[PDB]
């Protein structure tokens, strides 16, 4: 992977999540610095398959009409912890 990979691992993430997430910074979408600390924290408040779903669904969105790249991810994250029906 890239520059971001080693930082992401050290930002508390499991390897499985860090692997996918690094590539989001490689492909000219978002910065690795684009997040708020509330995202860095709420990221550890997921399990592996938790976070991996969030990463997929965040990629399976449209980052045309975004600005606040953090708040966008923060939105998807809320949806995933808020799954009671």
What distances in angstroms separate CA 54 from CA 8, 33, 37, 62, one per listed residue? 16, 18, 17, 14
Q: Which two tokens stand for residue 81?
A: 């912890």
How many residues does the structure list for the chain? Answer: 85
> Closest Cα to residue 21, out of 45, 42, 3?
3
DSSP state of 81: H
How many C-beta neighbours within 10 Å does residue 21 have?
A: 24
Q: 3-state SS of 14-51?
A: CHHHHHHHHHHHHCCCCCCCCCCHHHHHHHHCCCHHHH
Nearest to 34 by CA among 6, 66, 61: 66
Please tell me the experimental approach by which this structure was elucidated: NMR
Beta carbons of 17 and 40 less than 8 angstroms apart: no
- Of the candidates 81, 73, 66, 83, the residue with the CA atom closest to the CA atom of residue 36: 73
């Amino acid at each position: 992977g890239s520059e971001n990979f080693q930082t992401l691992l050290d930002a508390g993430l499991p390897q499985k999540v860090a692997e996918k997430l690094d590539e989001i910074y490689v492909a000219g979408l978002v910065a690795h610095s684009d997040l708020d600390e509330r995202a860095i924290e709420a990221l550890k408040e997921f399990n592996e398959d938790g976070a991996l779903a969030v990463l997929q669904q965040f990629k399976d969105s449209d980052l045309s009409h975004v600005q606040n790249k953090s708040a966008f991810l923060c939105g998807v994250m809320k949806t995933y912890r808020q799954r009671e029906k």
